mmCIF file of C-alpha atoms and ligand atoms in Angstrom:
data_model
loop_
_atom_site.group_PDB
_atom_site.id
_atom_site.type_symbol
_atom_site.label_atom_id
_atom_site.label_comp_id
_atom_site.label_asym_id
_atom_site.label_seq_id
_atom_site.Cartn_x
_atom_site.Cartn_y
_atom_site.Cartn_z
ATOM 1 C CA UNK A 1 -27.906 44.757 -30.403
ATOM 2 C CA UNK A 2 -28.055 41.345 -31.134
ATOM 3 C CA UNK A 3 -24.513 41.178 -31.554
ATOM 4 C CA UNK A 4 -22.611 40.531 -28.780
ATOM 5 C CA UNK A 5 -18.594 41.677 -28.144
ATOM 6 C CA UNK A 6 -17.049 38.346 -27.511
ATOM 7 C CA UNK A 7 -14.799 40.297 -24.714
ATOM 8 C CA UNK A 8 -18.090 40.307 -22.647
ATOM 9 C CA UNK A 9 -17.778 36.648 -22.780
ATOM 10 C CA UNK A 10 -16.595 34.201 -20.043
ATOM 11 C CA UNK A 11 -16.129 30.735 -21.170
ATOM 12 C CA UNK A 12 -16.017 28.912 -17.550
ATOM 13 C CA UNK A 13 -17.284 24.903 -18.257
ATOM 14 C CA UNK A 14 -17.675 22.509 -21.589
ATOM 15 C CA UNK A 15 -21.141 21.339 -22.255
ATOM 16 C CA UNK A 16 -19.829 18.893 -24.916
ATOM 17 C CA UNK A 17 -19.908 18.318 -28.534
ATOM 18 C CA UNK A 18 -22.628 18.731 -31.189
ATOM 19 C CA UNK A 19 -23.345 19.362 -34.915
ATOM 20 C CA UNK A 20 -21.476 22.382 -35.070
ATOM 21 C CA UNK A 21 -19.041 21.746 -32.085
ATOM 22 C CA UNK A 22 -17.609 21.980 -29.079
ATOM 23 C CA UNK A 23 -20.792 24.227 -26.464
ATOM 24 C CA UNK A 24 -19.651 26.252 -23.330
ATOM 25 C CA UNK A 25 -21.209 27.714 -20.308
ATOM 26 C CA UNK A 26 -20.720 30.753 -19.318
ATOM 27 C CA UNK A 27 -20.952 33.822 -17.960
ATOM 28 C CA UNK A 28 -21.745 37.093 -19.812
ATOM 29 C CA UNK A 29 -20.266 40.772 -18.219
ATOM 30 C CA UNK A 30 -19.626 38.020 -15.481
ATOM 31 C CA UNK A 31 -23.207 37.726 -14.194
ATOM 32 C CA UNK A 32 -25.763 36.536 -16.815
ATOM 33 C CA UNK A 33 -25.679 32.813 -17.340
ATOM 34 C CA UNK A 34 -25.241 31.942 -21.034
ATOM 35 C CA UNK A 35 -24.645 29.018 -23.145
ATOM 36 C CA UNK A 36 -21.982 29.513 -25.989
ATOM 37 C CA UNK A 37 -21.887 27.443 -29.172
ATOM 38 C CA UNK A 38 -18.017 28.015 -30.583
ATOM 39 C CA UNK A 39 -18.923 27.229 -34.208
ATOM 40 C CA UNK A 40 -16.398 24.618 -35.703
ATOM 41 C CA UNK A 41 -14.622 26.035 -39.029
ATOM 42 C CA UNK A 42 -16.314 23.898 -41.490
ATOM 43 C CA UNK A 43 -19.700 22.925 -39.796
ATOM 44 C CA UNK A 44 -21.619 25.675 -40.597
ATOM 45 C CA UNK A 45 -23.175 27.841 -43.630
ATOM 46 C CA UNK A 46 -22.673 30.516 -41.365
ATOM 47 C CA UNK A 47 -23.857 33.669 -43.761
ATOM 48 C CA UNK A 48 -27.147 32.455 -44.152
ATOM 49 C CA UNK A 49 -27.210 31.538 -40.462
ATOM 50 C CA UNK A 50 -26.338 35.641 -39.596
ATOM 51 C CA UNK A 51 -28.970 36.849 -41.881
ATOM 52 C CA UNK A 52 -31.737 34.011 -40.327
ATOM 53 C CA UNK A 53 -30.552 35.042 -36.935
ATOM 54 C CA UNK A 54 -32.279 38.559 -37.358
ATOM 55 C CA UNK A 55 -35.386 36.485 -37.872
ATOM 56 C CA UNK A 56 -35.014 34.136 -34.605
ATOM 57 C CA UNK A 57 -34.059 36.929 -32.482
ATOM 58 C CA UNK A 58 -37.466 37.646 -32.580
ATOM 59 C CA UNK A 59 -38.692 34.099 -31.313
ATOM 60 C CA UNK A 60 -39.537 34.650 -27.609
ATOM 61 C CA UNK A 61 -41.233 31.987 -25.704
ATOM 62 C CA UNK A 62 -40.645 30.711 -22.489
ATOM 63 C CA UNK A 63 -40.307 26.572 -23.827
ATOM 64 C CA UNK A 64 -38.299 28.043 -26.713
ATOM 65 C CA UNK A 65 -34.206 28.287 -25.654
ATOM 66 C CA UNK A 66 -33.786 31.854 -26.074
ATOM 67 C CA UNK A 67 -31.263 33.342 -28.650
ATOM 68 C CA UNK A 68 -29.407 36.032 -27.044
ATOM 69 C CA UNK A 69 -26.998 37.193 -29.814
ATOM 70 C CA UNK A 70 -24.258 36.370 -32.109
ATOM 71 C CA UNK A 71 -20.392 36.882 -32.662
ATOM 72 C CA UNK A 72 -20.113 37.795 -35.716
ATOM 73 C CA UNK A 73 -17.224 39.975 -35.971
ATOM 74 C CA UNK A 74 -14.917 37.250 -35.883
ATOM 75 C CA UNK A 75 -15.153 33.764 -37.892
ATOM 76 C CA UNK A 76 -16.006 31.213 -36.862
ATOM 77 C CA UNK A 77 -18.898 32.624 -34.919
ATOM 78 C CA UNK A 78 -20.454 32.096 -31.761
ATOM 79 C CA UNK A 79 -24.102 31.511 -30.601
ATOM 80 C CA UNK A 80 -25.167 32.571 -27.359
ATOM 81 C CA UNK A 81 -28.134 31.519 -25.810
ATOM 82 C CA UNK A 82 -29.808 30.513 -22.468
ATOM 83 C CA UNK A 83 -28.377 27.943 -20.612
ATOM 84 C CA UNK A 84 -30.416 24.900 -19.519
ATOM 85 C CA UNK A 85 -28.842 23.363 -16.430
ATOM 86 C CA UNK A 86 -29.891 19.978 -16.648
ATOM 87 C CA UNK A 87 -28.661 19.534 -20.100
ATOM 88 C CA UNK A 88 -30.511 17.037 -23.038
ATOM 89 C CA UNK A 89 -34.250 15.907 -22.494
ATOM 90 C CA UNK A 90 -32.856 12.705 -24.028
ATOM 91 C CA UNK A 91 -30.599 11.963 -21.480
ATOM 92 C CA UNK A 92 -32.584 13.432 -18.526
ATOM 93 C CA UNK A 93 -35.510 10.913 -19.308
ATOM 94 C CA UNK A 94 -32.677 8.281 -19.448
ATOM 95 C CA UNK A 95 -30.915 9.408 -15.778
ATOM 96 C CA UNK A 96 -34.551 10.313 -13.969
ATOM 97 C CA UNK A 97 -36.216 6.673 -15.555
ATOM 98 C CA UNK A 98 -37.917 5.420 -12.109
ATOM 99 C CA UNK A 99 -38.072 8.600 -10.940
ATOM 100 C CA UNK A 100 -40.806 10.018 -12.624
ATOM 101 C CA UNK A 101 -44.554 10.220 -12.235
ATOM 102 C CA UNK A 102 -46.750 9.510 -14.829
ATOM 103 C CA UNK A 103 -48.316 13.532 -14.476
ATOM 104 C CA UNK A 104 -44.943 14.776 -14.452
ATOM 105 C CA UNK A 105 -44.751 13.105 -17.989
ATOM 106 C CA UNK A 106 -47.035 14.790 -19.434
ATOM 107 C CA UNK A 107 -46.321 18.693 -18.495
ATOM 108 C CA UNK A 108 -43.277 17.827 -19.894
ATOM 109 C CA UNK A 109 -45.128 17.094 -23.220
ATOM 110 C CA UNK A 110 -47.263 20.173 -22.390
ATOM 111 C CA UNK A 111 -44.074 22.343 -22.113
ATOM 112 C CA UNK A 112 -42.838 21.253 -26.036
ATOM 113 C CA UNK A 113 -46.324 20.956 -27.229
ATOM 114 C CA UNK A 114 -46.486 24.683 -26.282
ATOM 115 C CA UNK A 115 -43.094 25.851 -27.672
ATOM 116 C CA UNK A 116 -44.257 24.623 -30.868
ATOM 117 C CA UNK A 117 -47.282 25.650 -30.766
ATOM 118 C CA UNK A 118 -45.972 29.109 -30.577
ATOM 119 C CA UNK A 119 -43.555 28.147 -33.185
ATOM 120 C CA UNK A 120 -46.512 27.102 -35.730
ATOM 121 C CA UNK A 121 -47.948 30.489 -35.214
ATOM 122 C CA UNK A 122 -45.138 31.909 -36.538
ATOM 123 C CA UNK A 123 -45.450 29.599 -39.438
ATOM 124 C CA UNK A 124 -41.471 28.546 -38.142
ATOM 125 C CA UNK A 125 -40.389 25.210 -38.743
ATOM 126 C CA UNK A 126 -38.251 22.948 -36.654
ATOM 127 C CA UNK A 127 -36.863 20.314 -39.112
ATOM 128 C CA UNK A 128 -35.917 18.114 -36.495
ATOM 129 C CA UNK A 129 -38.039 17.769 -33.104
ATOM 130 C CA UNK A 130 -36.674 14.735 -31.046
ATOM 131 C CA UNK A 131 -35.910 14.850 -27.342
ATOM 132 C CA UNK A 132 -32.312 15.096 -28.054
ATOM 133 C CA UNK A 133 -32.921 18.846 -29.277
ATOM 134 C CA UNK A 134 -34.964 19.411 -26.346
ATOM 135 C CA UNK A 135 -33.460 20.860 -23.446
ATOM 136 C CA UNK A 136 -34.008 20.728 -19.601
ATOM 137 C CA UNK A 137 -33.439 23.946 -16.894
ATOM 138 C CA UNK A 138 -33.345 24.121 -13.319
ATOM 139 C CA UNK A 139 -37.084 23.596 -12.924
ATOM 140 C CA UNK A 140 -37.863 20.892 -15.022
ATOM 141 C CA UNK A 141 -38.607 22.726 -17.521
ATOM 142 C CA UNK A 142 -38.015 20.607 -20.784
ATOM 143 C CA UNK A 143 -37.560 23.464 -23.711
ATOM 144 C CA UNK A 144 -37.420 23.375 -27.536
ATOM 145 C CA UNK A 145 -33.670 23.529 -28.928
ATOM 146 C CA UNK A 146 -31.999 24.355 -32.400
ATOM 147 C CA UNK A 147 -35.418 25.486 -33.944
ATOM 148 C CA UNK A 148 -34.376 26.097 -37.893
ATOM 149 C CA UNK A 149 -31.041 25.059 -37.256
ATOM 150 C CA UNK A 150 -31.039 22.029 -39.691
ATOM 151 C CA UNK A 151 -30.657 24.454 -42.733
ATOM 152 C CA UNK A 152 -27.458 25.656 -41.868
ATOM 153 C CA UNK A 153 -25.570 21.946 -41.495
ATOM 154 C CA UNK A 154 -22.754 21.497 -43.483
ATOM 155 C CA UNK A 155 -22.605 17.418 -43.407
ATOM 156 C CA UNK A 156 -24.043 15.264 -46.091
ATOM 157 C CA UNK A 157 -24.839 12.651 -44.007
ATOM 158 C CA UNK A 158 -26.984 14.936 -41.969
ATOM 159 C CA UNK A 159 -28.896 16.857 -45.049
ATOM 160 C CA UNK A 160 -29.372 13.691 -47.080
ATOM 161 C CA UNK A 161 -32.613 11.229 -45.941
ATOM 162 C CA UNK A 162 -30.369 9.118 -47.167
ATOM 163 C CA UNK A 163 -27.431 9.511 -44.625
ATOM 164 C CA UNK A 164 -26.396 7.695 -41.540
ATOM 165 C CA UNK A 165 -27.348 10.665 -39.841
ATOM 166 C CA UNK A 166 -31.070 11.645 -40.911
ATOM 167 C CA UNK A 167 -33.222 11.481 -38.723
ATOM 168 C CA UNK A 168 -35.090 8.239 -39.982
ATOM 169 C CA UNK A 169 -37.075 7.405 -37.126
ATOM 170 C CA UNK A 170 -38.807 11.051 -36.811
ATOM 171 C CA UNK A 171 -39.894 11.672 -40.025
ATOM 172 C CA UNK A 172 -43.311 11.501 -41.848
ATOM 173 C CA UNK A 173 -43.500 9.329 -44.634
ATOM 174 C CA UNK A 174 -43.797 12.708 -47.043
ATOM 175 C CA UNK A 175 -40.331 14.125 -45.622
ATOM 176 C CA UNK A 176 -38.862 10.481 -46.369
ATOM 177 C CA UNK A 177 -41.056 10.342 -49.788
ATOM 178 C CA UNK A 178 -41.053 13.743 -50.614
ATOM 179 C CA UNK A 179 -38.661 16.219 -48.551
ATOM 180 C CA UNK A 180 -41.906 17.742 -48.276
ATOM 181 C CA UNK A 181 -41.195 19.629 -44.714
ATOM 182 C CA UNK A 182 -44.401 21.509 -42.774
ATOM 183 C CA UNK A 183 -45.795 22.236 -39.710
ATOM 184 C CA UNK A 184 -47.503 18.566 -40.086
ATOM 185 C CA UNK A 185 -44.141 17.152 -40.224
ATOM 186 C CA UNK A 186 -43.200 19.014 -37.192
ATOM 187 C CA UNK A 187 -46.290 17.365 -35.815
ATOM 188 C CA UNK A 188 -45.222 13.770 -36.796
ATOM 189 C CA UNK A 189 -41.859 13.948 -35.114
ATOM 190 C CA UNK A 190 -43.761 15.619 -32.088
ATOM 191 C CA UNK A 191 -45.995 12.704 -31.759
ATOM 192 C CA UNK A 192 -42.695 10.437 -31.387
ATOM 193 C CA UNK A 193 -41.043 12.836 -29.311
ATOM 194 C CA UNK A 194 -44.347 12.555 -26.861
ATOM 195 C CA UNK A 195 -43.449 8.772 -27.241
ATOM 196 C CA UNK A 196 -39.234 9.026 -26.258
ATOM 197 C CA UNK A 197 -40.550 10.509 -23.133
ATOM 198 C CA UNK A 198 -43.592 8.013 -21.777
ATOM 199 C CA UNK A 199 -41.149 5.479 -22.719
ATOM 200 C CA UNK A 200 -38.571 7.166 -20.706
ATOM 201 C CA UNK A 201 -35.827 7.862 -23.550
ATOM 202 C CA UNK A 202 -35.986 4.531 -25.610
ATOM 203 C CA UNK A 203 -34.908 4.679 -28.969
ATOM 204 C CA UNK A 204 -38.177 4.431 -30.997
ATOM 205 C CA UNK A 205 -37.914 1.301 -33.730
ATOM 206 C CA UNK A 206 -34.656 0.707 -31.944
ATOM 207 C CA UNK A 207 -34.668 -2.985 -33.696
ATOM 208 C CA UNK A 208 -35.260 -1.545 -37.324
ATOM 209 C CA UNK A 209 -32.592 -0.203 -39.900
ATOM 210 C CA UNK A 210 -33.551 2.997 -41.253
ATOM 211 C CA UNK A 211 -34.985 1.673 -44.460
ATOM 212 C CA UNK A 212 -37.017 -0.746 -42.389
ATOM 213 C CA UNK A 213 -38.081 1.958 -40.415
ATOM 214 C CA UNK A 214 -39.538 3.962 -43.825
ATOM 215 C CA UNK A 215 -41.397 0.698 -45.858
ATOM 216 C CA UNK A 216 -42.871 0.295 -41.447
ATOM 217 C CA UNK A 217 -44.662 3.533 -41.322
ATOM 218 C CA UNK A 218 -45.202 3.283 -45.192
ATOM 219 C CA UNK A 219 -47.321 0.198 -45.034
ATOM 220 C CA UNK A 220 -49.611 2.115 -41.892
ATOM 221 C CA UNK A 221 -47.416 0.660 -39.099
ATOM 222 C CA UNK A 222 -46.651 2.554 -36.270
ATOM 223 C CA UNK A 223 -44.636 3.121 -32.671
ATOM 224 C CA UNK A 224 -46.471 0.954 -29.890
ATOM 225 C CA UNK A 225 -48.583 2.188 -26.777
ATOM 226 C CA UNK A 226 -45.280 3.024 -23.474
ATOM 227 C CA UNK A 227 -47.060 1.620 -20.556
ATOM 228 C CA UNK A 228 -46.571 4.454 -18.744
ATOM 229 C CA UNK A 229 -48.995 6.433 -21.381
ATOM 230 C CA UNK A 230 -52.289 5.543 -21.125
ATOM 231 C CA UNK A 231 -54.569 5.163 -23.957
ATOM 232 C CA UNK A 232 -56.061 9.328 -23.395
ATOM 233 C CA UNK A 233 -52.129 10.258 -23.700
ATOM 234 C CA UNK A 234 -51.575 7.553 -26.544
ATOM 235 C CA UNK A 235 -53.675 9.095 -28.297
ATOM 236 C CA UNK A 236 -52.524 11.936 -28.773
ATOM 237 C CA UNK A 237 -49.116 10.862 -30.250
ATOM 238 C CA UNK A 238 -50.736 8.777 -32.387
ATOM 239 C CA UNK A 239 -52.826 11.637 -33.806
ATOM 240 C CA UNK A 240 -49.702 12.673 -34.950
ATOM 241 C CA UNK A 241 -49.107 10.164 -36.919
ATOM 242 C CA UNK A 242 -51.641 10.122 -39.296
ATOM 243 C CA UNK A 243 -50.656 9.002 -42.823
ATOM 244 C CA UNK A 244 -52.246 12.037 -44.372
ATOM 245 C CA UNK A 245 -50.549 15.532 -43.479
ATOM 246 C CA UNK A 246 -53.691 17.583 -43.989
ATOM 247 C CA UNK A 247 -55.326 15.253 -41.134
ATOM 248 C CA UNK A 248 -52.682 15.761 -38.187
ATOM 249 C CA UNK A 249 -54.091 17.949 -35.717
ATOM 250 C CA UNK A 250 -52.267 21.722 -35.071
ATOM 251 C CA UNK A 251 -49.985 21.821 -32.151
ATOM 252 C CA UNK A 252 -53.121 24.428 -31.229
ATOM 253 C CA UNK A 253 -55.493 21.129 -30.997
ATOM 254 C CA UNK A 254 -53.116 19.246 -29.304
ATOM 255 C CA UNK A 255 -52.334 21.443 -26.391
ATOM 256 C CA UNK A 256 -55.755 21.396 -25.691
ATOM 257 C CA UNK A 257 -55.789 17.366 -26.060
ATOM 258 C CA UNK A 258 -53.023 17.611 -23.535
ATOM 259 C CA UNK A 259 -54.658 20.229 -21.352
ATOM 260 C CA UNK A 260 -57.676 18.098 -20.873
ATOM 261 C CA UNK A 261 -55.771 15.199 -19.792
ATOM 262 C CA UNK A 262 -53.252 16.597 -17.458
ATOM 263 C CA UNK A 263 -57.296 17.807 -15.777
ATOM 264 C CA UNK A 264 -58.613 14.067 -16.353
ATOM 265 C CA UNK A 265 -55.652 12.420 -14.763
ATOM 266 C CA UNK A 266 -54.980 14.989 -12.201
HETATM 267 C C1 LIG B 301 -27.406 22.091 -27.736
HETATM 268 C C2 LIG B 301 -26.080 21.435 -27.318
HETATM 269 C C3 LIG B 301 -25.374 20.599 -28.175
HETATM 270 N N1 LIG B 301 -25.981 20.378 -29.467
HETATM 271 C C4 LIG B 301 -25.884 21.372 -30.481
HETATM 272 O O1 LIG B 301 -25.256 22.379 -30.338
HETATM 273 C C5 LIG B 301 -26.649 21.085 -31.765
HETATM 274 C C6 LIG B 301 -26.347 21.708 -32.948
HETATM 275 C C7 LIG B 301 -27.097 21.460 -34.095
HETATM 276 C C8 LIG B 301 -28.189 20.593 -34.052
HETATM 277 C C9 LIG B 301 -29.002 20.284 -35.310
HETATM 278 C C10 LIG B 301 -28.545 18.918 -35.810
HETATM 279 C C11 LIG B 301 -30.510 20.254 -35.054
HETATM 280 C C12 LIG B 301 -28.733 21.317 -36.391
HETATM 281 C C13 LIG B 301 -28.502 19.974 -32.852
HETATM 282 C C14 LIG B 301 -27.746 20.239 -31.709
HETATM 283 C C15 LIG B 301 -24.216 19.965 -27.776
HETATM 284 C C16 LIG B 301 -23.716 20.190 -26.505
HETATM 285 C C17 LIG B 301 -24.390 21.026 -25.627
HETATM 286 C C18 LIG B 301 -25.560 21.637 -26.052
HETATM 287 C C19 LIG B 301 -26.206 22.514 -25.017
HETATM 288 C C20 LIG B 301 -26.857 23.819 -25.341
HETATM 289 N N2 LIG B 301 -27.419 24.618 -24.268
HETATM 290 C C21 LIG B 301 -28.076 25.850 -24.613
HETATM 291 C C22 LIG B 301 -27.325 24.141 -22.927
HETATM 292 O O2 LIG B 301 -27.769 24.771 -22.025
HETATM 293 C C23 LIG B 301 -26.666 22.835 -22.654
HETATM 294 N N3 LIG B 301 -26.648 22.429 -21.293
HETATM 295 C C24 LIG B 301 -26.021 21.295 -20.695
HETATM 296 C C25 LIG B 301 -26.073 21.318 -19.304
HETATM 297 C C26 LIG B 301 -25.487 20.292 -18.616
HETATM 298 C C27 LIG B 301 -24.829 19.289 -19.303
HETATM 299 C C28 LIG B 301 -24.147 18.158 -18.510
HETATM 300 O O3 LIG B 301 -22.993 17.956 -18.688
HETATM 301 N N4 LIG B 301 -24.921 17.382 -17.542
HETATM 302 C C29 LIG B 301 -26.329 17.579 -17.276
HETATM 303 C C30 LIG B 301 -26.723 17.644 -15.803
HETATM 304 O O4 LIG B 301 -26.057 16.707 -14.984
HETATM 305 C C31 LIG B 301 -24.689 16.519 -15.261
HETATM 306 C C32 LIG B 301 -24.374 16.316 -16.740
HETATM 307 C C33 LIG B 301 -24.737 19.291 -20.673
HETATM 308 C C34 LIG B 301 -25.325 20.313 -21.392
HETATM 309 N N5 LIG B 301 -26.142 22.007 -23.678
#
């Protein structure tokens, strides 16, 4: 069902290199496009992954990548989901910088405001919305990536808010505080997503350490208005941002914040 014979598989291009390793295109029975993740020995908690998998096979949304099955017959396994043509938001925003207008902008916050929208209805948490786990297809459409995933990393320097590789600059002061994770933390790093893409893929506190970065947003400071964003759109990322959780709006509200721009400004 969900599992998939790896002998249907066709591994035809490298996508690169991520958490867990090396990511192919593909082809499945030779027709279906398909994106295969060729889980590094080591990388992975894999067993809890297989039995969480039974769980996210049942997250269907059309901004969510899809999760089309597993290899699990064989170790290590493979992940196969959509593929999204135009690879990582991050480095879309980054190629496409002067190329962009300002409406276009914001369905693309529209599309991941309403992935994880559908997400919070489901009372399923990302752990680690940024536009690098967002993903971009053939249309434009940007699309929520690796959903959950951040429970299954092997690497203490990932895990630990205290590692090189936490991600600092996303997290509410309660995650950094706390490890207190929640849909309101979800909202938080959504807010700074919404700011990586009016500010067309800058790193956000890009002159502060990562320590800096958590005493900043302790003492009420936050990430300044992109140009690009005008104050309607600014503030809605910086509704995310509020200090406390209780009082960030529900990706529910703020799909209809963005819904009544996108009318306002076009
Ligand atoms: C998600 C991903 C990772 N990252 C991870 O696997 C990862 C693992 C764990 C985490 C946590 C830390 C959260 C646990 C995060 C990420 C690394 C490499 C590739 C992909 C990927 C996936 N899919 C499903 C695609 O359709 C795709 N598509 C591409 C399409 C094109 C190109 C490309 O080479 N391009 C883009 C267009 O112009 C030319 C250059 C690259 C990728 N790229």
């Amino acid at each position: 069902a969900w599992e998939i014979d790896p002998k249907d598989l066709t591994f035809l291009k490298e996508l690169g290199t991520g958490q867990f390793g090396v990511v192919k295109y593909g082809k499945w029975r030779g027709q279906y496009d398909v994106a295969i993740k060729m889980i590094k020995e080591g990388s992975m908690s894999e067993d809890e992954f297989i039995e969480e998998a039974k769980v996210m096979m049942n997250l269907s949304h059309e901004k969510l990548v899809q999760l089309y099955g597993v290899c699990t017959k064989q170790r290590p396994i493979f992940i196969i989901t959509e593929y999204m043509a135009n690879g990582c938001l991050l480095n879309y925003l980054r190629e496409m910088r002067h190329r962009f207008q300002t409406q276009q902008l914001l369905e693309m916050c529209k599309d991941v405001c309403e992935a994880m929208e559908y997400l919070e209805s489901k009372q399923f948490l990302h752990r680690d919305l940024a536009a690098r786990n967002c993903l971009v297809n053939d249309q434009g459409v940007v699309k929520v990536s690796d959903f959950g995933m951040t429970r299954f990393v092997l690497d203490d320097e990932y895990t630990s808010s205290t590692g090189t590789k936490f991600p600092v600059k996303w997290a509410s002061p309660e995650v950094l505080m706390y490890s207190k994770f929640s849909s309101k933390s979800d909202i938080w790093a959504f807010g700074v997503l919404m700011w990586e893409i009016y500010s067309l893929g800058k790193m956000p506190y890009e002159r502060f350490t990562n320590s800096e970065t958590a005493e900043h947003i302790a003492q009420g400071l936050r990430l300044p208005r992109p140009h690009l964003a005008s104050e309607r759109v600014y503030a809605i990322m910086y509704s995310c941002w509020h200090e406390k959780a209780d009082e960030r709006p529900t990706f529910k509200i703020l799909l209809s914040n963005i819904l009544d721009v996108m009318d306002e400004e076009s």
